[PDB]
């Protein structure tokens, strides 16, 4: 989409795509930067 999208989806644990994350409010939060295309729909 632009320079380098930022992965910020939430999960139940650091995802293989977001080795860096944080568990808050019970879910997770991604703080990585990647953009191999427009997006993952």
């Amino acid at each position: 989409e632009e320079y380098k999208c930022y992965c910020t989806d939430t999960y139940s644990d650091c995802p293989g795509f977001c080795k860096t994350c944080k568990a808050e409010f019970g879910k997770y939060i991604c703080l990585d930067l990647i953009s191999p295309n427009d997006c993952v729909k």
């Binding site: 992965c7 910020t8 991604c30 953009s35 993952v40």
Partner: peptide, 11 residues
Amino acid sequence: TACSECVCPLR
């Protein structure tokens, strides 16, 4: 396949 919540408000 990365994440479904990709942040990119600025194509």
